[PDB]
């Protein structure tokens, strides 16, 4: 079993994954300065469970063990809320994407979905999945959730693409398992993971049956190639000096995972051709994940903190407009938080026994996350001033000629250390333009689906026929009232009482 | 005991309150067409408790009775959440302000505050207050919450006003009780209430001791005058015909309550000179009330439904831009709901036993409420079209010459009854410009305090120093870290891992 | 000739238009308290021309006379700008819709359109139109612009409606002229006008030929019935007392115009069957009218003033948040102003000699008008406080017992007259919820087309192919560059120089 | 005389400016890959003037020469509008900050300000300034506008700082000129300029008289040290390969200018102790420069085009939500343009003869600029998809094994070259997170002052008392009407009926 962050880091050494970064094979990711910040972030998920056991670990009814909360199958609405509390804490502690939420949300969504496949088909995907959960809980591993394919022409489904590999598919089968080819793009923390769960990314039709595959692969499976994603300001991490990085210790990681006839044994296959359940899996995965964006409220707390610090250093902490902007940042940030925890608080039990958060409220959390981080970032930049983008390099600050000039001229209020003022400005740059903006801004935009995806799911659940009848009642319209034909689950949850 | 909405309406008859409306004494408010819709709204709070007992009634540990949820002192976070579920449901059912939330929030806030006054002062305000709760629970009454005074010069406190009566104060005392003078403005449902609880509206200093008065008065108390507030489109109610009203059955009510040496016996006095607790009472009342604005999400549901209906009648229900606007309305509306129910879900036990919702999240609920109704209304008007403001009167629709012309020319898609298209347009007008916009828009703006009041309360709780230290840690700043000196309660609630006393 | 406002009001007396309001024919609109505010607003357009001749009157090349600017066919970009300056002034002076812009914009758009019909068809519409212009310039009359039909099913065109009358059409022809039936809805100031110009409201196909009719009718034409539109708080005008009206002197007017076989002689027909020019007329009318919404910036000025006045009366004029809100109101209001005048400044000469403002910039003006008045309103309500909607009636203020109580208890800061505080609150109510909100809010929303209409026009002129090529150039993309196939007029205006 | 952009590039060679970048003196900025894109942007200001003479060149009444429009003292409202037309075109052509506007706005503002100093004090700053304009017009030079000092404690003015050098000041004088010390921060294109005009940045009181200094210095003046500013993704320029840069040919430049006893001869001094005119100079400089932000609408045009291109490549160009977002971007961008050109169109003649644009409308232009680029960028990222931030490097694309995998898997619709999809994504990254976002976003925010600065200037001109009286009139309030005590100039311009007097 992995126990500490240090144990986790050790577990990543000597694995010989095939990883391309800047046209070179990376022999040891743990030692690569661009990659190590992402690993440190994951390590903190282990360290928090040691320092704050009630927050970051759970009693598993599946294994009868205390497990890391990222590997816990939620047994109550309270367990869902605890995920959110842990996520905000980790965002405060790291200021970045700590990567492990995807696999948590994947596992929780698989628990219920596998149960339902088996109920219809008489298969044993749920039994297979539970044995997997027991293993990863006992060993305390990091699990990637690999849903999003490259997708090719966005207007066409899998079976209509010119190249069938643009969504991940079964290419062959034998007595011992399946072989899959394809790719998964934008994969958070995959190189830092022990196992990756491949999942379909779209509703599938009967024509798309070969793409109805879910399966768990070890990170070091044969036939996998990882091609690392660049980030804004990525190579600052490779430069000597830590100031210009802004957040030197922590960062995120994305890569493209290429699959060439990768083998998955039957015991790790959780869906095989049951195309009509792809949409259920995507729906439930995105239901959880869309309110895991509570994590971004911890980032928000850090960015607010940074804005308040630079205002202090600049000698204008208590001016009205700055105080007002800091309030606005806080308000926006808490609006996201409220939506996410409301979703979790409103969760309900699924047939398999796992709790699922409220889907509608999850869409609201995520939809606001697509908007507000951009505004929080803009207001931070206002408060910081122009030096947030014109500051000289640390190499210049350390220079014998340029350095004293910078120490003199980049003074803020008397008594503030210029190096501290530099460091806080670089943190702001990092979160609004640089490496951690990838997560704070663009992942807020696209993670668990682009804005339009949330709108379509709100549309599905927003009970417009029910609402029409409310309005007709009040307007005294009686003669054209129609029975709603729509999903009616949301108001059943909103108005749930002990009498149903 | 009042059981039904009909019983409630009968309890309002024959009371001879002194009520001025349009320069006339109103002899029987129940029979006045401008007032009756607000009565109907309150009656629905009784009817809902009969139809949906688990939603709208509660088991009181105070009395051991099943009580209307508006009279219940919340015993759990679940109880707070149920207040919100009830609120949204009543909003859906009435499309208006149903008035009784203010008294519920007042009672909940007084339960904890009176306990704490007594703890310090050795008084028996809490005992008095519980006897009051028992009475109103047994009798199933409507309670007004009368906090906001007229206030005069906004830049000055009570003792600095030119006229001391511009905030409500004690003017005399005797062996049996106190006598108060002043006024309470903007008072929701006061004429429709059985009792009204007077409460200070602002932090009080020692110089403001005379204004540190909380007391319950019967609505028919001697020395009270009510001066009714106008509303946008108020007088449509008094015209024959119901179409132009939009929502003819339900509305809200506000009045100015004047107090001239009104007597309050000791048993109904819940604060008497302990000025240092005024800020506690206001804080806690506003904490509850700022997330009672979940009620406005039920009104949002109605408005969304009206916009979808007119789109249907117009022949364009499925056009992209309209669908996208209805999604937006829904998203903004649910954002408010989420904030309010999160506040309630995150509630904590007070010393007296009552649960208080999360103050920070209440601020967020209300602050959003100050913004989003205005946008939902704008979008509704876009979807409706120009006829929302140019539609001819019902008297023209019923006219032998004009009426057939309107039935011909105001057609929507084939098969839609023109009267139904007119009715839905009037509903939209009513909620965005007319009588129900008073509540949906302007009370969203000012109820439980104007926007700036929320911003100041967010500021008080937003833990800037804590957050500065988070940022310093990540930036590698170590040599100027300061211990925060600020309220730290919010993050204690946010990161609370279990429900414990130790 | 009409010269003064008083002359204009006299011109309206004794006409016996058939006007239904509240199920009764109105005997004398000039004396009806609900109608007279709208008449007063139009009278101000005459009085302004006497007080401020350079602003509100123009030298007409067509008649060789000084004419009211509302009747002037623009001869330069300066003439378009002067329209806007006059509009804002009139908004400041009346705080309402003063009605006469529609006819101005109709006439300017007909001047160019008629010329183009004739260029193609060899007809005499432009010559007819110019004789009409000469007459109304000499007589100094008020002209309604009656474009918008009731429209029936919004998803169907004229020839597809279940009732052909739902758009206005020719129903018969004589040796002397045409006969039209139909209706025009939401008609600004029509009962207050001398002449009304009927115009088609949509693109017409060949099947819609019967609906290709433009003609001028006198307001007292046989076969016309007017049905007056309600407004929020309309009947306050009919109550004794002026306080509760907010703006007692001025207001707007809409009515539904019903046409039953109304005769139009040939000399007043400016389009007869040339369906392919309907789109041109609608485009050019809306081009002008979309930036006539500068008028709403004068209303904004009044509402800002009212907000600042109530802050003063409340004793908090200089508090930071109120100052900031006032600034925001000002910024939004000026953004609308700027878009309007930029459109006008960028105008270009048409074949007929009239100048047309920049259509793209007009769209931007209007689109911002659909948004910002709602925000300005919201902020005014914030500043005013709750009394803006809970204030007792004037009848209570004048009562011998209730009145003294109101004088005492509705005090603001010392020295402020309570009646003045009541008055300013009622003005705010009037402009944000009551009669003048119809114009300020809902007419901002729908006048010259609902928001979507402006979006479609921006789309038509936004030169996406040109922009794609800009980006491809800078990205170093060379091998898939396509020639744009789109209207290219906007950037020709943006970059216009003496060299073309 | 410099004619072409090539001539301009050659003029920059061999000057030996002291420039620190990454802890080294830069030997030849023209050949440094981080610096050359900024140079290329300035070169395009010369090339445009050759290609499009009427747009980018002007007939100067000062010299009687045809001059680059960046060196032209505006003689009409039309000349102000032409500045904005040129700005938007340059933004379209470069997608970056092309640097030369700041000098233009500085020179326009100094023209009127020097005249007024002399009118009061009997000095010859205006005559000196005109000789300077003649020189730079004849030689066709690039002029920096160096106003913003580092400023120290933002709550304190110059004479109150702990270190007097935190705002630039005169430290000595002699028979031939003044000597100045201090620094100027965030200086656009300064290393790419021939001359730099130093100007005070704040209202000055009598105690601040030593800081009341305006003067022109050659970029190669003795006692000057430049310290280059970093930019998001700066070092991509220094890597082999051009794809990951997004916009490889063009970028911006900002440096800290350190002044150590720099000599300015009298003929290049345009203010010397007349502290009461600092406010005037700042106001007028910011008046012009706040609507020079029309430049950002040309950048908006590029970003819109990039968003439309990626939608095409992805196979969803005509989906309603994407079309609607494109429309929104266009609307916000045009709103900025309209405010700027309205300001220009509404310009008025100053005492010296130069035209000044409408200050109120400039504030509105700039204030919208502080908001809308951020939304345009957000929408572009929505349309692009996740690859805008997860795309592998060009070195991976060119790798013999990884490259073919990327060519296969990063396909868009059939027929789209994957290299072109990569390139357009990098352009979007460059403009929203990388090197050109410095200008598009953060300079939109702070250039010519932070948002609060615009709010205070709107407040000064918004004629609240006048508006209160409008509302009083309509409400029927007659007995407490007060005469406004405020600047009344804006509505004088709004309601001006003719071009007179
Ligand atoms: S983006 Fe945030 S929610 Fe998603 S995996 Fe990263 S830390 Fe967790
Ligand atoms: S406004 Fe809403 S929350 Fe307030 S009392 Fe009325 S119904 Fe309840
Ligand atoms: S709404 Fe404005 S632009 Fe339209 S007619 Fe009325 S005053 Fe003129
Ligand atoms: S940021 Fe734009 S306006 Fe400013 S100098 Fe650069 S190109 Fe010109
Ligand atoms: Fe995510
Ligand atoms: Fe309220
Ligand atoms: Fe209009
Ligand atoms: Fe700038
Ligand atoms: Na490093
Ligand atoms: Na580094
Ligand atoms: Na009635
Ligand atoms: Na009625
Ligand atoms: Na009247
Ligand atoms: Na009246
Ligand atoms: Na390079
Ligand atoms: Na490069």
Tab-separated table of N, CA, C and O in Angstrom, chain C residues 218-275:
chain	number	residue	atom	x	y	z
C	218	UNK	N	-54.047	59.903	-44.697
C	218	UNK	CA	-54.296	60.844	-43.623
C	218	UNK	C	-54.796	60.093	-42.409
C	218	UNK	O	-55.470	59.071	-42.544
C	219	UNK	N	-54.463	60.614	-41.237
C	219	UNK	CA	-54.897	59.962	-40.009
C	219	UNK	C	-56.422	59.842	-39.927
C	219	UNK	O	-56.914	58.942	-39.240
C	220	UNK	N	-57.173	60.722	-40.617
C	220	UNK	CA	-58.630	60.686	-40.570
C	220	UNK	C	-59.235	59.957	-41.772
C	220	UNK	O	-60.416	60.168	-42.073
C	221	UNK	N	-58.447	59.097	-42.443
C	221	UNK	CA	-58.942	58.335	-43.586
C	221	UNK	C	-60.156	57.477	-43.221
C	221	UNK	O	-60.200	56.861	-42.162
C	222	UNK	N	-61.112	57.373	-44.148
C	222	UNK	CA	-62.228	56.443	-43.986
C	222	UNK	C	-61.750	54.991	-44.006
C	222	UNK	O	-60.878	54.626	-44.774
C	223	UNK	N	-62.331	54.169	-43.128
C	223	UNK	CA	-62.064	52.746	-43.058
C	223	UNK	C	-61.033	52.401	-41.983
C	223	UNK	O	-60.676	51.261	-41.834
C	224	UNK	N	-60.454	53.409	-41.339
C	224	UNK	CA	-59.508	53.205	-40.257
C	224	UNK	C	-60.222	53.213	-38.900
C	224	UNK	O	-61.032	54.096	-38.627
C	225	UNK	N	-59.841	52.277	-38.037
C	225	UNK	CA	-60.221	52.253	-36.621
C	225	UNK	C	-58.934	52.118	-35.817
C	225	UNK	O	-58.103	51.296	-36.145
C	226	UNK	N	-58.815	52.897	-34.743
C	226	UNK	CA	-57.694	52.805	-33.836
C	226	UNK	C	-58.184	52.136	-32.545
C	226	UNK	O	-59.211	52.495	-32.002
C	227	UNK	N	-57.370	51.233	-32.016
C	227	UNK	CA	-57.627	50.648	-30.727
C	227	UNK	C	-56.407	50.898	-29.850
C	227	UNK	O	-55.326	50.380	-30.101
C	228	UNK	N	-56.607	51.724	-28.828
C	228	UNK	CA	-55.513	52.232	-28.024
C	228	UNK	C	-54.907	51.122	-27.169
C	228	UNK	O	-55.591	50.231	-26.616
C	229	UNK	N	-53.606	51.254	-26.973
C	229	UNK	CA	-52.899	50.284	-26.170
C	229	UNK	C	-52.833	50.741	-24.719
C	229	UNK	O	-52.635	51.923	-24.435
C	230	UNK	N	-53.026	49.791	-23.790
C	230	UNK	CA	-52.784	50.088	-22.388
C	230	UNK	C	-51.291	50.331	-22.136
C	230	UNK	O	-50.419	49.896	-22.865
C	231	UNK	N	-51.003	50.974	-21.027
C	231	UNK	CA	-49.649	51.059	-20.509
C	231	UNK	C	-49.675	50.775	-19.011
C	231	UNK	O	-50.680	51.041	-18.355
C	232	UNK	N	-48.545	50.270	-18.495
C	232	UNK	CA	-48.379	50.167	-17.060
C	232	UNK	C	-48.675	51.506	-16.394
C	232	UNK	O	-48.125	52.524	-16.793
C	233	UNK	N	-49.557	51.516	-15.402
C	233	UNK	CA	-49.912	52.723	-14.665
C	233	UNK	C	-50.673	53.751	-15.495
C	233	UNK	O	-50.799	54.915	-15.067
C	234	UNK	N	-51.235	53.326	-16.638
C	234	UNK	CA	-51.922	54.243	-17.550
C	234	UNK	C	-52.947	55.143	-16.864
C	234	UNK	O	-52.982	56.384	-17.062
C	235	UNK	N	-53.794	54.529	-16.039
C	235	UNK	CA	-54.949	55.224	-15.506
C	235	UNK	C	-54.584	56.195	-14.386
C	235	UNK	O	-55.436	57.001	-13.977
C	236	UNK	N	-53.318	56.222	-13.942
C	236	UNK	CA	-52.932	57.268	-12.993
C	236	UNK	C	-53.134	58.656	-13.610
C	236	UNK	O	-53.418	59.621	-12.908
C	237	UNK	N	-52.988	58.747	-14.928
C	237	UNK	CA	-53.203	59.995	-15.639
C	237	UNK	C	-54.641	60.500	-15.490
C	237	UNK	O	-54.906	61.699	-15.572
C	238	UNK	N	-55.575	59.565	-15.291
C	238	UNK	CA	-56.996	59.877	-15.219
C	238	UNK	C	-57.455	60.215	-13.795
C	238	UNK	O	-58.584	60.651	-13.605
C	239	UNK	N	-56.585	59.982	-12.811
C	239	UNK	CA	-56.821	60.323	-11.429
C	239	UNK	C	-56.505	61.796	-11.182
C	239	UNK	O	-55.599	62.359	-11.806
C	240	UNK	N	-57.255	62.384	-10.245
C	240	UNK	CA	-56.988	63.712	-9.729
C	240	UNK	C	-55.606	63.661	-9.094
C	240	UNK	O	-55.229	62.651	-8.500
C	241	UNK	N	-54.820	64.701	-9.293
C	241	UNK	CA	-53.498	64.771	-8.684
C	241	UNK	C	-52.430	64.373	-9.701
C	241	UNK	O	-52.658	63.463	-10.510
C	242	UNK	N	-51.290	65.070	-9.670
C	242	UNK	CA	-50.232	64.838	-10.644
C	242	UNK	C	-48.989	64.128	-10.074
C	242	UNK	O	-48.127	63.703	-10.852
C	243	UNK	N	-48.893	63.969	-8.747
C	243	UNK	CA	-47.674	63.439	-8.164
C	243	UNK	C	-47.469	61.979	-8.582
C	243	UNK	O	-46.354	61.571	-8.932
C	244	UNK	N	-48.534	61.178	-8.459
C	244	UNK	CA	-48.405	59.733	-8.650
C	244	UNK	C	-48.098	59.353	-10.092
C	244	UNK	O	-47.572	58.258	-10.332
C	245	UNK	N	-48.326	60.273	-11.031
C	245	UNK	CA	-47.981	60.049	-12.432
C	245	UNK	C	-46.453	60.005	-12.663
C	245	UNK	O	-45.983	59.451	-13.664
C	246	UNK	N	-45.681	60.677	-11.794
C	246	UNK	CA	-44.229	60.761	-11.896
C	246	UNK	C	-43.774	61.806	-12.894
C	246	UNK	O	-43.099	62.755	-12.550
C	247	UNK	N	-44.112	61.583	-14.135
C	247	UNK	CA	-43.948	62.569	-15.189
C	247	UNK	C	-45.343	62.895	-15.704
C	247	UNK	O	-45.919	62.150	-16.510
C	248	UNK	N	-45.951	63.925	-15.109
C	248	UNK	CA	-47.348	64.209	-15.405
C	248	UNK	C	-47.550	64.838	-16.788
C	248	UNK	O	-48.651	64.727	-17.364
C	249	UNK	N	-46.530	65.570	-17.278
C	249	UNK	CA	-46.730	66.357	-18.477
C	249	UNK	C	-46.573	65.544	-19.769
C	249	UNK	O	-47.188	65.859	-20.786
C	250	UNK	N	-45.700	64.544	-19.754
C	250	UNK	CA	-45.309	63.846	-20.964
C	250	UNK	C	-45.437	62.338	-20.838
C	250	UNK	O	-45.149	61.747	-19.792
C	251	UNK	N	-45.777	61.734	-21.974
C	251	UNK	CA	-45.837	60.290	-22.110
C	251	UNK	C	-45.869	59.882	-23.579
C	251	UNK	O	-45.759	60.723	-24.474
C	252	UNK	N	-45.948	58.578	-23.827
C	252	UNK	CA	-45.993	58.064	-25.188
C	252	UNK	C	-47.376	57.494	-25.502
C	252	UNK	O	-48.297	57.590	-24.716
C	253	UNK	N	-47.530	56.995	-26.707
C	253	UNK	CA	-48.810	56.555	-27.232
C	253	UNK	C	-48.541	55.449	-28.234
C	253	UNK	O	-47.774	55.674	-29.189
C	254	UNK	N	-49.232	54.326	-28.035
C	254	UNK	CA	-49.331	53.271	-29.042
C	254	UNK	C	-50.803	52.945	-29.308
C	254	UNK	O	-51.652	53.008	-28.414
C	255	UNK	N	-51.079	52.514	-30.540
C	255	UNK	CA	-52.380	51.966	-30.883
C	255	UNK	C	-52.261	50.959	-32.025
C	255	UNK	O	-51.274	50.969	-32.775
C	256	UNK	N	-53.261	50.082	-32.102
C	256	UNK	CA	-53.465	49.202	-33.225
C	256	UNK	C	-54.324	49.907	-34.268
C	256	UNK	O	-55.396	50.413	-33.951
C	257	UNK	N	-53.812	49.983	-35.500
C	257	UNK	CA	-54.500	50.601	-36.608
C	257	UNK	C	-55.129	49.498	-37.447
C	257	UNK	O	-54.423	48.650	-37.974
C	258	UNK	N	-56.460	49.513	-37.519
C	258	UNK	CA	-57.212	48.558	-38.318
C	258	UNK	C	-57.592	49.240	-39.631
C	258	UNK	O	-58.163	50.326	-39.604
C	259	UNK	N	-57.303	48.572	-40.755
C	259	UNK	CA	-57.577	49.105	-42.073
C	259	UNK	C	-58.632	48.240	-42.762
C	259	UNK	O	-58.385	47.066	-42.987
C	260	UNK	N	-59.776	48.828	-43.115
C	260	UNK	CA	-60.839	48.099	-43.805
C	260	UNK	C	-61.144	48.759	-45.147
C	260	UNK	O	-61.829	49.776	-45.190
C	261	UNK	N	-60.519	48.242	-46.205
C	261	UNK	CA	-60.671	48.734	-47.570
C	261	UNK	C	-60.375	50.226	-47.652
C	261	UNK	O	-61.166	50.984	-48.206
C	262	UNK	N	-59.238	50.632	-47.083
C	262	UNK	CA	-58.865	52.034	-47.051
C	262	UNK	C	-58.310	52.405	-48.432
C	262	UNK	O	-57.461	51.695	-48.965
C	263	UNK	N	-58.771	53.535	-48.979
C	263	UNK	CA	-58.353	53.993	-50.289
C	263	UNK	C	-57.052	54.788	-50.205
C	263	UNK	O	-56.897	55.676	-49.367
C	264	UNK	N	-56.170	54.510	-51.167
C	264	UNK	CA	-54.952	55.261	-51.355
C	264	UNK	C	-54.876	55.658	-52.814
C	264	UNK	O	-54.729	54.795	-53.670
C	265	UNK	N	-54.943	56.969	-53.116
C	265	UNK	CA	-54.793	57.403	-54.490
C	265	UNK	C	-53.386	57.157	-55.016
C	265	UNK	O	-52.432	57.116	-54.245
C	266	UNK	N	-53.257	57.027	-56.337
C	266	UNK	CA	-51.976	56.722	-56.957
C	266	UNK	C	-50.878	57.694	-56.512
C	266	UNK	O	-49.729	57.310	-56.301
C	267	UNK	N	-51.206	58.964	-56.330
C	267	UNK	CA	-50.165	59.925	-56.009
C	267	UNK	C	-49.596	59.743	-54.601
C	267	UNK	O	-48.611	60.394	-54.249
C	268	UNK	N	-50.188	58.866	-53.794
C	268	UNK	CA	-49.689	58.588	-52.453
C	268	UNK	C	-49.231	57.139	-52.329
C	268	UNK	O	-48.956	56.654	-51.228
C	269	UNK	N	-49.166	56.442	-53.460
C	269	UNK	CA	-48.627	55.086	-53.509
C	269	UNK	C	-47.151	55.156	-53.911
C	269	UNK	O	-46.820	55.691	-54.986
C	270	UNK	N	-46.277	54.618	-53.044
C	270	UNK	CA	-44.846	54.672	-53.289
C	270	UNK	C	-44.229	53.302	-53.556
C	270	UNK	O	-43.007	53.200	-53.709
C	271	UNK	N	-45.056	52.255	-53.538
C	271	UNK	CA	-44.644	50.912	-53.940
C	271	UNK	C	-45.920	50.144	-54.229
C	271	UNK	O	-46.868	50.219	-53.461
C	272	UNK	N	-45.945	49.453	-55.361
C	272	UNK	CA	-47.116	48.722	-55.828
C	272	UNK	C	-46.687	47.456	-56.564
C	272	UNK	O	-46.643	47.405	-57.793
C	273	UNK	N	-46.407	46.409	-55.785
C	273	UNK	CA	-46.189	45.075	-56.314
C	273	UNK	C	-44.716	44.686	-56.493
C	273	UNK	O	-44.438	43.533	-56.816
C	274	UNK	N	-43.784	45.626	-56.279
C	274	UNK	CA	-42.366	45.385	-56.482
C	274	UNK	C	-41.782	44.761	-55.228
C	274	UNK	O	-40.982	45.383	-54.524
C	275	UNK	N	-42.184	43.501	-55.024
C	275	UNK	CA	-41.947	42.757	-53.808
C	275	UNK	C	-40.460	42.655	-53.468
C	275	UNK	O	-40.107	42.533	-52.292
